[PDB]
Write a protein that binds this DNA or RNA. Structure first.
Ligand code: NA
Ligand code: NA
Length: 327
DNA sequence: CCGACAACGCATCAGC
DNA sequence: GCTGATGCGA
DNA sequence: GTCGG
């Protein structure tokens, strides 16, 4: 349904969500509001009362009260207040910088550091990650059109194969589900030489080649199994350069790869269903493996998986294209 | 009433 | 120095 | 904040 339906309500709930997350440091309330916003965003009717909204899963007494006030006044007093609150709005704003969470934002604001300008003037008080987040503040809030993700995928697959043609790399996330745009790029990597019972350089070799051809421009974090960094598509001579993008690369054991590709492709809603169904058949499915559940509730050794389909068959389910995994 | 709401890799901190 | 906790991620 | 044992 068009945002026009209950957009006022959902915007309100999302704003409250952010304040709970960034200022109150109540991650669970953050998610409660977001869940409420999502369920309302899907409601194909213009809500007339809080009571109506409450019938939806995730909407309780408090949000129904808030909705009644918003419908009758066109606003929410508590929200109007926190908005004008210079400390709260500043803290909320700073967390938009990658690397700056609620704690760092609160500390910065406590010492007079409230704007990007203030951050820019206090480089010594920012860790490596935060400096990068500051440097690419604008770029990181820009979405990535599918066309660019394809070009990005082109480079990643080419270079990975160039390093070692036995590597297997899959770009997951909504992008794999066919989405029109993405917020970042998530690459899952594996190699036949690496298994749950297996070289501390498989990931490094890949990251290194990507840096060599200048695709990866910065590193936020990097260990033996996970890389989180920055990348940028090459620009055509005399053309506006593409913005820098966030990219994560995970190295996963071969025997857990597909369970990983399944999990990281989502959606989160679909994961919950497939897992809810997995239990019925008596199978435990996590991001790493799928195991059998004994009558006493004891999970046995992980089941061999060599494809995403194997998982579906284990729990008797027709393989559903990532494109149809909306839920 | 009152605990769960995911879990963990990495960077960095806090304590010894 | 080491080990465990915390912040962050999203 | 919401849900549910
Ligand atoms: Na409800
Ligand atoms: Na942040």
């Amino acid at each position: 349904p068009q945002e026009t339906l209950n957009g006022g309500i959902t915007d309100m709930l999302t704003e409250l969500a952010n304040f709970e997350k960034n200022v109150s440091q109540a991650i669970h309330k953050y998610n409660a509001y977001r869940k409420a916003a999502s369920v309302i965003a899907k409601y194909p009717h213009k809500i007339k009362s809080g009571a109506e909204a409450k019938k939806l899963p995730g909407v309780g007494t408090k949000i129904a009260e808030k909705i009644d006030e918003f419908l009758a006044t066109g606003k929410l007093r508590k929200l109007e207040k926190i908005r004008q609150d210079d400390t709260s709005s500043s803290i909320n704003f700073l967390t938009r910088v990658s690397g700056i969470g609620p704690s760092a934002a609160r500390k910065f604001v406590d010492e007079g550091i409230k704007t990007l300008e203030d951050l820019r003037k206090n480089e010594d008080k920012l860790n490596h990650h935060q400096r990068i987040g500051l440097k690419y503040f604008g770029d990181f809030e820009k979405r990535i059109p599918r066309e660019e993700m394809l070009q990005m995928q082109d480079i990643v697959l080419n270079e990975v194969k160039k390093v070692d043609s036995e590597y297997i790399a899959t770009v997951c996330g909504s992008f794999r589900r066919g989405a029109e745009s993405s917020g970042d790029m998530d690459v899952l990597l594996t190699h036949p030489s690496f298994t749950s019972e297996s070289q501390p350089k498989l990931l490094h070799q890949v990251v290194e080649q990507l840096q060599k051809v200048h695709f990866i421009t910065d590193t936020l974090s990097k260990g033996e199994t996970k890389f989180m960094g920055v990348c940028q598509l090459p620009s055509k001579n005399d053309e506006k350069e593409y913005p820098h993008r966030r990219i994560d690369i995970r190295l996963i054991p071969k025997d857990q790869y597909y369970c990983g590709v399944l999990y990281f492709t989502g959606s989160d809603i679909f994961n919950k269903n497939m897992r809810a169904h997995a239990l019925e058949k008596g199978f435990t499915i996590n991001e790493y493996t799928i195991r059998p559940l004994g009558v006493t509730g004891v999970a046995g050794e992980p089941l061999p998986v060599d494809s995403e389909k194997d998982i579906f068959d284990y729990i008797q389910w027709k393989y559903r294209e990532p494109k149809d995994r909306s839920e």
